Amino acid sequence: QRQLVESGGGLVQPGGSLRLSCAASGSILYFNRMGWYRQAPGKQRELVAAITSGDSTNYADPVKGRFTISRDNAKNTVYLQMNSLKPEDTAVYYCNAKEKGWSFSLYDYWGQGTPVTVVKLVIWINGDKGYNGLAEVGKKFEKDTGIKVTVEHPDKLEEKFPQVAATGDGPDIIFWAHDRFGGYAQSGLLAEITPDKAFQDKLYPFTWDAVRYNGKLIAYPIAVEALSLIYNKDLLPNPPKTWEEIPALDKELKAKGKSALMFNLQEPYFTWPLIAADGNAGAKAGLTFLVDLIKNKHMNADTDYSIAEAAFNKGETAMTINGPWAWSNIDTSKVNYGVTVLPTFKGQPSKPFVGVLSAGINAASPNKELAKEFLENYLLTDEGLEAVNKDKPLGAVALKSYEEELAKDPRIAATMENAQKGEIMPNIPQMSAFWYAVRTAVINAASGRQTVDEALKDAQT
Numbered sequence: 387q388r389q390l391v392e393s394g395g396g397l398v399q400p401g402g403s404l405r406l407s408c409a410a411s412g413s414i415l416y417f418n419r420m421g422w423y424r425q426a427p428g429k430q431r432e433l434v435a436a437i438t439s440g441d442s443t444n445y446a447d448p449v450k451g452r453f454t455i456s457r458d459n460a461k462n463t464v465y466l467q468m469n470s471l472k473p474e475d476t477a478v479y480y481c482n483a484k485e486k487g488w489s490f491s492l493y494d495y496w497g498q499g500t501p502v503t504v505v506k507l508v509i510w511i512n513g514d515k516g517y518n519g520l521a522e523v524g525k526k527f528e529k530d531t532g533i534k535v536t537v538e539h540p541d542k543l544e545e546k547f548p549q550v551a552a553t554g555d556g557p558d559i560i561f562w563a564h565d566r567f568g569g570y571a572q573s574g575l576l577a578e579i580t581p582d583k584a585f586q587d588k589l590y591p592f593t594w595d596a597v598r599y600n601g602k603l604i605a606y607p608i609a610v611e612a613l614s615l616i617y618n619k620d621l622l623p624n625p626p627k628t629w630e631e632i633p634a635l636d637k638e639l640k641a642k643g644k645s646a647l648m649f650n651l652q653e654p655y656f657t658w659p660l661i662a663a664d665g666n667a668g669a670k671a672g673l674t675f676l677v678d679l680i681k682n683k684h685m686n687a688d689t690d691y692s693i694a695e696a697a698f699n700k701g702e703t704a705m706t707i708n709g710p711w712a713w714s715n716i717d718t719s720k721v722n723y724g725v726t727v728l729p730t731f732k733g734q735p736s737k738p739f740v741g742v743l744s745a746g747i748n749a750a751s752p753n754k755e756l757a758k759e760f761l762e763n764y765l766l767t768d769e770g771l772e773a774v775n776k777d778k779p780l781g782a783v784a785l786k787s788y789e790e791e792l793a794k795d796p797r798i799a800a801t802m803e804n805a806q807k808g809e810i811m812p813n814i815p816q817m818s819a820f821w822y823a824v825r826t827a828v829i830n831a832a833s834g835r836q837t838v839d840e841a842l843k844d845a846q847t
C-alpha cells in the first residue's frame with residue numbers, strides 16, 4: 387500500500403528555519419495534489435501549502451511569502467521550507483496526498499504528523515538594571531536547551547505590563563520590585579510559583595515573604611534594594627550626616643561652580659525617604675524642606691534620573707541618591723565615590739522604602755515550565771547572579787550562598803544600613819494608586835502649583 391512518512395519537525399527560534407520532508411511508498415506521479423496542513427492545540431485543520439501535478443503552488447495568507455512548497459519526483463518527496471518562523475506557526479504539521487482512481491472516484495492519504503515548535507523566551511526588566519548580564523545567562527540557557535532568551539527594557543513597563551499582558555501576549559517573565567506584584571496577582575495576571583523545598587531553601591526565608599499574596603507565592607525573590615547616599619570623596623570627604631546642613635554646604639559649593647546634591651525628583655521613590663523621616667506632621671515637615679531647597683535655588687525644578695546621574699558622574703555635583711544598580715556607571719567614570727547612610731532629618735533617620743527585585747511568570751504564557759527552569763537552574767544560582775551583578779549591581783542578593791561576598795562589599799553595608807532604617811513596601815493592590823498620588827503631590831509642590839498642606843489633602847483621599 388501507499389504510506390506517507392513526515393520528518394524534520396523540531397524546536398527553533400523565531401526568524402529561524404526548518405525543512406519538513408514527506409516521503410511516500412509509491413510514485414508521486416500518481417498523485418493529483420500533495421500538500422501540508424497544520425493543527426495547533428485546540429484548533430481546526432489549516433492548509434498552509436499545496437502543489438498539484440500541474441506544478442501550480444498555492445499558500446495560505448499567513449505563511450505566504452515565508453514558506454515554499456517543493457517536490458522531488460526522484461526522491462518521491464514533498465518538502466516545506468519554512469523560513470523566517472513565528473510563534474503563530476507552532477503546530478503539528480501533516481502531509482496530505484490525493485489520487486484519482488482509474489474510475490471516477492479519488493483517494494485521500496495522510497501521514498503521522500511532525501511537530502514544529504517556535505519558542506522564544508522574552509523577559510521584561512527595567513533599563514536601569516543589568517539586562518546585558520541577564521542576557522549572558524540567557525545565552526548559556528540556549529546552549530544547554532535550544533530556547534532563545536531575548537531581554538527587553540521598555541519605558542513604563544510597570545504600567546505597560548498589566549495592559550499588554552492582560553489582552554495581548556507581552557512577556558513570559560516580568561522583573562520589578564515586589565510592591566507592584568500584588569496588583570498583578572489580584573487582577574489574575576500572574577501564575578502561582580511552585581518551587582521544590584531544595585530550591586526554596588537556597589534563598590533567605592524573609593525574601594519569600596515579600597513575594598507572597600494571600601498565601602500564594604507570586605514571584606521569585608532576586609535581591610533587596612535600598613537607596614543610599616552616593617558621594618564624591620574628592621569634592622566632599624566628610625559628607626553631611628543631616629539634611630538640614632545641605633543648604634550651607636550648597637552655598638559653599640556653588641561658589642566653586644558645583645552643586646551639593648542632585649537626585650531624581652520626578653520619581654517619588656527617591657523623595658519618599660525625606661518625606662517619611664519623621665512620619666501627618668512628619669510628611670508636612672519633610673516635604674516643606676524639599677520645597678525650600680527648590681525655592682532657595684539649591685536644586686533644579688525638573689531634576690530627573692538622567693541629568694542627576696550625568697552630573698554626578700561628570701563631577702558637577704558632590705552628592706546623589708541612588709541604588710546598587712547605579713554604581714557600575716560611576717566606576718566607568720573617573721569619580722572616587724562613596725556610598726553611605728542617607729542624611730537624617732529632624733534628628734531621626736530618613737526612612738527609604740525597601741524593594742525586593744522579583745521575577746514573576748505571566749499567567750497568559752505557554753512557556754511557564756521553561757521559564758521556571760531558567761529562573762531556578764540558571765538565574766538564581768551563584769554563577770547566574772554573578773553575571774547580572776558584574777553588569778549592574780543587584781544589591782543584597784536573596785541567595786544564601788552569597789552572604790560572604792555581600793559582606794565583603796562596603797557599598798552593600800551602606801545599602802543594608804539604609805534598608806534597616808527604612809521598611810519593606812507592602813505588596814497590596816492599592817500601591818499603584820498610592821504611588822501615583824505621591825508622584826503628583828511631589829511634582830505639584832516642586833513646580834509651584836499646590837501648597838504642602840493641600841498636597842497631603844488630595845493624597846490621603
Ligand SMILES: OC[C@H]1O[C@H](O[C@H]2[C@H](O)[C@@H](O)[C@@H](O)O[C@@H]2CO)[C@H](O)[C@@H](O)[C@@H]1O
Nearest residue numbers: 512514563565566653654655656741821
Ligand atoms: O518612583 C516610584 C516607583 O518606585 C519604585 O520603583 C523603583 C524601583 O523599585 C527601582 O528598582 C528603581 O529602578 O526605580 C524605581 C523608581 O524610579 C516602586 O517599586 C514602584 O512601584 C513605584 O512606581
